[PDB]
Design a protein around this ligand. Structure first.
Ligand SMILES: O=P(O)(O)OC[C@H]1O[C@H](O)[C@@H](O)[C@@H](O)[C@@H]1O
Ligand SMILES: O=P(O)(O)OC[C@H]1O[C@H](O)[C@@H](O)[C@@H](O)[C@@H]1O
Ligand SMILES: [Mn+2]
Ligand SMILES: [Mn+2]
Lengths: 146, 146
């Protein structure tokens, strides 16, 4: 029921993005985690433990505090020859960095003929800009293969 | 020295992006061209013939119209494990599509140990969204390798 919402009112959405979401369906049931911080990622599904529409959360290992990095109600997806880029906007706001803008998760999914999905890896966080900051992640998936 | 301009006041830009432009220095002197339209791409240098500050132009072959897809004064650049994404914002405005926003160029540079830079070609144009449209291109470069 609760799935990724694309930019644009019902019917105004990009046919390319709509087609891609449909292609990513086999990933909806999965969950990815990687650990200080523990990042949990899910495709168009609630990864958070607060029912806050979080598609990717960052759990503070010391006290189990959860920060929403991106919400799936603000999804953008597009692909190239052997990769798919997924972007979750609308995360929790920074308190000091990036003009206090909402956090954002950028996931680069590269082609891997050997698995439906694996090797989810947090790559880096860019919080040193006045705007357009982001957390970058990578993962493998045969769905990214063309 | 005229180059790519990053988000933020001169000197106080992301060091991650600054380091990337540095790494891409050997591409500055090159010119890339696609193999109805023809596309010319340049890294931090004028790609057009009308002094418009274009980083990537689209030439309509039948009439010679040069449309600025992206300007190097609005550059964003980041990398992953074996790829680098370069984005030029501030292109010519759409007259009917995408809420008449400025065109945007997204270039995905993949690792290729056999060439400094080659295989630049258009992937697609997303102009069916109410906002956040873009032209997607791909190119190979050993510089994108780790
Ligand atoms: O202090 P600020 O501006 O809230 O920024 C916050 C830092 O907070 C937390 O430790 C995490 O979410 C980090 O990824 C983030 O960089
Ligand atoms: O008519 P609009 O809204 O200006 O959109 C314009 C079309 O114009 C030109 O032919 C090119 O630039 C195309 O890439 C673009 O999609
Ligand atoms: Mn905070
Ligand atoms: Mn136009």
């Amino acid at each position: 029921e609760k799935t990724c919402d694309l930019v644009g009112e019902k019917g105004k959405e990009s046919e390319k993005e709509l087609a891609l979401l449909k292609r990513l369906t086999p990933l909806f049931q999965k969950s990815f985690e990687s650990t200080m911080y523990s990042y949990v990622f899910r495709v168009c599904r609630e990864a958070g433990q607060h029912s806050s529409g979080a598609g990717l959360v960052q759990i503070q290992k010391s006290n189990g505090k959860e920060t929403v990095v991106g919400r799936f109600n603000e999804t953008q997806i597009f692909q190239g020859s052997n990769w798919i880029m997924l972007i979750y906007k609308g995360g929790d706001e920074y308190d000091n960095h990036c003009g206090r803008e909402q956090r954002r998760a950028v996931v680069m999914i590269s082609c891997n003929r050997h698995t439906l999905a694996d090797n989810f890896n947090p790559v880096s966080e860019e919080r040193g800009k006045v705007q357009d900051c982001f957390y970058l992640f990578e993962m493998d998936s045969s769905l990214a293969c063309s």
